[PDB]
Write a protein that binds this ligand. Structure first.
Ligand SMILES: CC[C@H](C)C(=O)O[C@H]1C[C@@H](C)C=C2C=C[C@H](C)[C@H](CC[C@@H]3C[C@@H](O)CC(=O)O3)[C@H]21
Ligand SMILES: [Mg+2]
Length: 182
């Protein structure tokens, strides 16, 4: 059918410049691969606050992933995940911003630490949520369990834990083998 996909990427202070970059490159790889498909994209950066780097309308209008994310400025603050999510839910998946009413709403969260806030994600009930946790902060099984609450059930299917940002490349290779013409 139609897939409206939003990348919710972590731009906290824990990230080294090169790690932030690998996050941006992953997003561009996926978008470059699925260009001219049924997929529509939007990108939202989160730390303390939230910024929509580009919405579904910009994507359709300019279509170039490199131009779309060219002026992203790393925020360097905390990780307010609950707020970031309801923000997407309520401010990004909006028709005025180019979201298609008959589209499946998928949300891919990319983070490197646990959440520095709280609340609930009820506004995001009908959104498919994948969570990609990367790095040292998710070494313990205990810290990996904190992500389960932002992701769709079953977590083993929706939560991805990578030990290095180098692994995001291996994740893209794994994504590519599931690409099929229907
Ligand atoms: C597909 C395997 C890769 C590693 C992956 O998980 O990509 C997931 C997670 C992430 C690596 C990027 C994605 C980009 C596009 C789609 C939404 C993809 C999930 C596609 C699957 C296939 C159907 O069951 C629909 C669905 O809900 O999820 C995600
Ligand atoms: Mg962090």
């Amino acid at each position: 059918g139609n897939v409206d996909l939003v990348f919710l990427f972590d731009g906290s202070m824990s990230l080294q410049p090169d790690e932030f970059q690998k996050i941006l490159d992953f997003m561009k790889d996926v978008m470059k691969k699925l260009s001219n498909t049924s997929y529509q994209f939007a990108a939202v950066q989160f730390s303390t606050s939230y910024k929509t780097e580009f919405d579904f309308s910009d994507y359709v209008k300019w279509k170039d992933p490199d131009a779309l994310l060219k002026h992203v400025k790393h925020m360097l603050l905390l990780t307010n995940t609950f707020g970031a999510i309801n923000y997407v839910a309520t401010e990004v998946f909006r028709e005025e911003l180019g979201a298609r009413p008959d589209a499946t709403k998928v949300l891919i969260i990319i983070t490197d630490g646990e959440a520095t806030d709280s609340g609930n994600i009820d506004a995001a009930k009908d959104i498919i949520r994948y969570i990609i946790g990367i790095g040292k902060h998710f070494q313990t099984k205990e810290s990996q369990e904190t992500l389960h609450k932002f992701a769709s059930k079953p977590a083993s299917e929706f939560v991805k834990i990578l030990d290095t940002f180098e692994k995001l490349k291996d994740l893209f290779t794994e994504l590519q083998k599931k690409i099929y013409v229907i």
